[PDB]
């Protein structure tokens, strides 16, 4: 699949809103992920004891993890599908070290869309939601290919 320039511009326009406060957005996204899919928290060896939203919010270390993830995602989205350099090390760490199934990337894609819908309806209307779905789907498909190259199904 490919995104049009129109679609990339919708994706990057709403992404600029995230950058007003990446840490706050990442906190919402991670908490959404963990509460919607408690099994995902088990993958974070440093944080798997933080089993409620109140505990999650009170860890600056967890919020720094959120910043790291969203900063990397922002850089990937700005490659507009020419993102192969950014994905090889990311796939290697998530396939082989963190052991993240592709389905968990579908979960965090869901959480990202949910948080953007909650916080930025003025720039996350119907067209922008479709474009972001496609951009994150492309990210997951390209990661899944790199998983396969490393011998992991995902
Ligand atoms: C948009 C999707 C994601 C992006 C861009 C992303 C990015 C990153 C980056 C850049 C790092 C630090 C370098 C590395 O270890 O590769 C990291 C660490 C990590 N990621 Fe991801 N990630 C994503 C999704 C996920 C998901 C869904 C999970 C688990 C359900 C996960 C689990 C982890 C863990 C456990 C670490 C190590 C955290 C720590 O330092 O304690 N990642 N991620």
Author numbering: 0 to 153
Paper text:
For this study, a sperm whale myoglobin variant Mb(H64V,V68A) with high activity and stereoselectivity for olefin cyclopropanation reactions via non-native carbene transferase activity59−63 was used as the model enzyme. Using a myoglobin-based cyclopropanase as a model enzyme, our studies show that covalent stapling with p-chloroacetamido-phenylalanine (pCaaF) provides higher stapling efficiency and enhanced stability (thermodynamic and kinetic) compared to the other stapled variants and the parent protein. Crystallographic analyses of singly and doubly stapled variants provide key insights into the structural basis for stabilization, which includes both direct interactions of the staples with protein residues and indirect interactions through adjacent residues involved in heme binding.
To gain molecular insights into the effects of the engineered thioether staples on the structure and stability of the myoglobin protein architecture, we sought to determine crystallographic structures of the stapled variants, focusing on sMb5(pCaaF) and the doubly stapled sMb13(pCaaF) variant. For comparison between staples, the structure of sMb5(O2beY) was also pursued. Structures of sMb5(O2beY), sMb5(pCaaF), sMb13(pCaaF) (P212121 form), and sMb13(pCaaF) (P21 form) were determined to resolutions of 1.7, 1.17, 1.3, and 1.3 Å, respectively. Importantly, well-resolved electron density can be observed for the eUAAs and cross-linked cysteine residues, further demonstrating the formation of the thioether covalent bonds. Consistent with previous results, the parent protein Mb(H64V,V68A) showed a melting temperature of 63.0 °C, while sMb2(O2beY) and sMb5(O2beY) were previously determined to have a higher Tm′ by 10.2 and 13.0 °C, respectively (entries 1, 2, and 6). In this assay, Mb(H64V,V68A) exhibits a T50 of about 61.1 °C (entry 1), whereas sMb2(O2beY) and sMb5(O2beY) exhibit 2.7 and 10.4 °C higher T50 values, respectively (entries 2 and 6). For example, the amide bond in the pCaaF-Cys cross-link should result in considerable reduction in the conformational flexibility compared to that in O2beY, which has instead an ether moiety (leading to an additional rotatable bond). We find that the pCaaF ensemble has the lowest number of energetically feasible conformers, while pAaF and O2beY have a greater number of conformers (pCaaF < O2beY < pAaF) in the unfolded state model. Thus, stabilization is expected to follow the order sMb5(pCaaF) > sMb5(O2beY) > sMb5(pAaF), which agrees well with the experimentally observed values.
